[PDB]
């Protein structure tokens, strides 16, 4: 039927998986025990959970995700958390050796003996699945373990499974903040390895996530929970089409076909418009007009790119809640009449709309507002070339003075592969202006 499998790699990428699965159980009302009240929803595992959970007649909702990590510190603590009884023990794939930010260490040294065992989980999850539209890959480019392992995994799952979709979600490297100086190294290494197999890579940056927090959410001191909650809302919104119905129902297959223009470049940008504090929404009102202006407001994006320094290609809006297409197509018509919004002349139309009746909900102990009209804005533009343009001059200096190379070549690489990526990057940027050139 309509189901998918989620993947969470890297200790940084597992606490995010915790939150969404925490989030996902709330709207489904899943108790911490793992079963429903006496109300009738259990069976052979077929209801709103069947797309996400596997609630066998034993009553235990089994989430369709696998958390893989190599440092048992965090994964054991959540194994002592609240929902650990729901989480399958060896689905919470732990490891005993980190990659030390080294992509290849996570790609060669230990991944060999670990990729075999996860593949058993995959096939034992694949067989019980019926529709299996695709995968939800959660990771990070600057992955101490997220980078190296998933790369071999995404390769191995691609070579046996190359017909279904693979959705990749990773934190983009902070443009001006660096928690690691090898972080650029594996990042370009990850990109060049993934460009020829990754289907759709959607990115996000925490700084502007933080910027939103004290701009409109008005929190000067949030925590990861809020960061995790807001990204968890994003994936929740895109998955509501599976969860509920609407005026029209869309699918990731339509997303891919209508988002990516041409091969290679498959890197659009997401955004959620009604990001606001609770009290503000209390004594103000939400409608399609202002949120449409808001979602296209350049400072509302989590990626440090000026749209007026680039040009638009696709923009996909997913209106969840109570809306009528009357104002929707009217409001976006005014957006088309807007002159600052510079789509490429190649596309007269570039708008993909998804309507869902279900109002987005608050979370207990939450920070969000009481949402009725919501939209997720997935767009792709040419103003992203600066990011890799930032990376290459970051990379080229470091590679010329070849710092930390003794670490990598010490355990068995050479400079050819680092060489290849830079013209792959050079091919990447040179592509950007050529398609940018009309």
């Amino acid at each position: 039927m309509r189901e998918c499998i989620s993947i969470h790699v890297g200790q940084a990428g597992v606490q995010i998986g915790n939150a969404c699965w925490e989030l996902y159980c709330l709207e489904h009302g899943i108790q911490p025990d793992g079963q429903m009240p006496s109300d009738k929803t259990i069976g052979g595992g077929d209801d709103s959970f069947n797309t996400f959970f596997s609630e066998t007649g034993a009553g235990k909702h089994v989430p369709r995700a696998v958390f893989v990590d190599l440092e048992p510190t965090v994964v054991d603590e959540v194994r002592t958390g609240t929902y650990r009884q729901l989480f399958h023990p060896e689905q919470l794939i732990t490891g005993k050796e980190d990659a030390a930010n080294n992509y290849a260490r996570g790609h060669y040294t230990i991944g060999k003996e670990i990729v075999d065992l996860v593949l058993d989980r995959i096939r034992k999850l694949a067989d019980l699945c019926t529709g299996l539209q695709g995968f939800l890959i959660f990771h990070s480019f600057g992955g101490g373990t997220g980078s190296g392992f998933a790369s071999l995994l995404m390769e191995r799952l691609s070579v046996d499974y190359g017909k279904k979709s693979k959705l990749e979600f990773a934190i983009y490297p902070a443009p001006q903040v660096s928690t690691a100086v090898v972080e650029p190294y594996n990042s370009i290494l990850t990109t060049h390895t993934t460009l020829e197999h990754s289907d759709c890579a959607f990115m996000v940056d925490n700084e502007a996530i933080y910027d939103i927090c004290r701009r409109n959410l008005d929190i000067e001191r949030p925590t990861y929970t809020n960061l995790n909650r807001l990204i968890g809302q994003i994936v929740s919104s895109i998955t509501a089409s599976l969860r509920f119905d609407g005026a029209l129902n869309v699918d990731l297959t339509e997303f891919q076909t209508n988002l990516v223009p041409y091969p290679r470049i498959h890197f659009p940008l997401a955004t959620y418009a009604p990001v606001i504090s609770a009290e503000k929404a209390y004594h103000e009102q939400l409608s399609v007009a202002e949120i449409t202006n808001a979602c296209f407001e350049p400072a509302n994006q989590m990626v440090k790119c000026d749209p007026r320094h680039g040009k638009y290609m696709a923009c996909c809006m997913l209106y969840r809640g109570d809306v009528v297409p009357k104002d929707v197509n009217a409001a976006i018509a005014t957006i088309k009449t807007k002159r600052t919004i510079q789509f490429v002349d190649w596309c007269p139309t570039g708008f993909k709309v998804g309507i869902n009746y279900q109002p987005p909900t608050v979370v207990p102990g939450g920070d969000l507002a009481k949402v009725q009209r919501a939209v997720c804005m997935l767009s792709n533009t040419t103003a992203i070339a600066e990011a890799w343009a930032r990376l290459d001059h970051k990379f080229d200096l470091m590679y010329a003075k070849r710092a930390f190379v003794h670490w990598y070549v010490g355990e068995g690489m050479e400079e050819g592969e680092f060489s290849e990526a830079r013209e792959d990057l050079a091919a990447l940027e040179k592509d950007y202006e050529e398609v940018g050139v009309d």
Binding site: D251, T257, N258, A314, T349
Partner: protein
């Protein structure tokens, strides 16, 4: 006896026919369960032109529903009349379309054409003698375009002596949502015009304007939009089914409607559309009907034929009328705008009067038009096609599917021919 087999195609069609069928059922007085409540004798006789007999006074709709996405069908099955439809009629596949015409027209259709052919011929053998078939779909619909283009082709050699009635809605000119829609529209129309004999053109934006103009309800439903288009189609179906001195055969209409083979695309027209106070503020008289019937606002199909001229026009009147008022109104409009018709043919008017009024109103009518107002339509798709084919945007899928640019060459070239054809005939 001459009957009709219906085809329920495309996901928009999945909303279309469901509304279209319930409009029929509520007109005839059958309960949602299906046991017909005997109330009108004339409808008791002529229902068989669309419905067959099940046990216990239950009239089975002779429609076939096809899709790939179960949820729409589940919603249709959970509709107010899903029980009256047969699970046998619910043929589908286990895949997602991706809103791809080529996958539907070459990949997903291939394993579905066999079963749907069996179902229809089973239904075809169930009935005795058909006028033809009618097909609810859209030209901009991913599955509808892929299915219909295949389905119309196969039935052409199967039954080359029947009516290939079609239903396609033109997507919104201002926004097509689907960006590859102009590709799908251009592809479908090529096979369409070759295979089709009749085509009604419908656009959502005019209906939205109609909502702004007479409905005045601000926030309607697309089902209310379905309600309107179903009412338009229900009216033209009343001709065959109801008695009264009006000649009903679509072939009777088509020969009165089609001067040359390349004329398949036609526009609908409807009768009294009324606002809040005007239901109790309207003097229901054939003059004001005729005035409203020929109103530039009253159209809903594509755009104003004010830009062009009028080739063939035909309006069917439903209710208690007489030959004289429609005659003098025809003279009045003939003297009103004589030059706006083509000097090629005078007296382009075709009139049929159904003496049986609908349930809810007495004076009613429908209009079918063939004017020179389609140029704006296919010229519009032309720059879209040329601009996107200028640099082959979003094309690797179709090569990945197995499509080549050569197919596009004649597709637009055939489209360019009809641009001149409509131009040359009128200009």
């Amino acid at each position: 006896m001459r009957e009709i087999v219906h085809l329920q195609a495309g996901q928009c069609g999945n909303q279309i026919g469901a509304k279209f069928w319930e409009v029929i059922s509520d007109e005839h007085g059958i309960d949602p369960t299906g046991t017909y409540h005997g109330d009108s004798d004339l409808q008791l006789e002529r229902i068989n032109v669309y419905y067959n007999e099940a046990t216990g006074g239950k009239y089975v709709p002779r429609a076939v529903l096809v899709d790939l996405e179960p949820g729409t069908m589940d919603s249709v099955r959970s509709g107010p009349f899903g029980q009256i439809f047969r699970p046998d009629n619910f043929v589908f596949g286990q895949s997602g379309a991706g809103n791809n015409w080529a996958k539907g027209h070459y990949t997903e259709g291939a394993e579905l054409v066999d079963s749907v052919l069996d179902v229809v011929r089973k239904e075809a053998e169930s009935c005795d003698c058909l006028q033809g078939f009618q097909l609810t779909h859209s030209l901009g619909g991913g599955t509808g375009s892929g299915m219909g283009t295949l389905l119309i082709s196969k039935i052409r050699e199967e039954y080359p002596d029947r009516i290939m009635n079609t239903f396609s809605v033109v997507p919104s000119p201002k926004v097509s949502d689907t960006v590859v829609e102009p590709y799908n529209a251009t592809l479908s129309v090529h096979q369409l015009v070759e295979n089709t004999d009749e085509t009604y053109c419908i656009d959502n934006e005019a209906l939205y304007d109609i909502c702004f103009r007479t409905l005045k309800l601000t926030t309607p439903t697309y089902g209310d939009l379905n309600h309107l288009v179903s009412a338009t189609m229900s009216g033209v179906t009343t001709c065959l089914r109801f008695p009264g001195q009006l000649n009903a055969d679509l072939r009777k209409l088509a020969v009165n409607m089609v001067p040359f083979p390349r004329l398949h695309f036609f526009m609908p027209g409807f009768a009294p559309l009324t606002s809040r106070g005007s239901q109790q503020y309207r003097a229901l008289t054939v003059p004001e009907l005729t005035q409203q019937m020929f109103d530039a606002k009253n159209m809903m199909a594509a755009c104003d034929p004010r830009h062009g001229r009028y080739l063939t026009v035909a309006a069917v009147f439903r209710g208690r009328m007489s030959m004289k008022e429609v005659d003098e109104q025809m003279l009045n409009v003939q003297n009103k705008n004589s030059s706006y018709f083509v000097e090629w043919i005078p007296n382009n008017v075709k009139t049929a009067v159904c003496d049986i009024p609908p349930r809810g109103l007495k004076m009613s009518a429908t209009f079918i038009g063939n004017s020179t107002a389609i140029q704006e339509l296919f010229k519009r798709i032309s720059e879209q096609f040329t601009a996107m084919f200028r640099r082959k945007a979003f094309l690797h899928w179709y090569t990945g599917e197995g499509m080549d640019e050569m197919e596009f060459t004649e597709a637009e070239s055939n489209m360019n021919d009809l641009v001149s054809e409509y131009q040359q005939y009128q200009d």
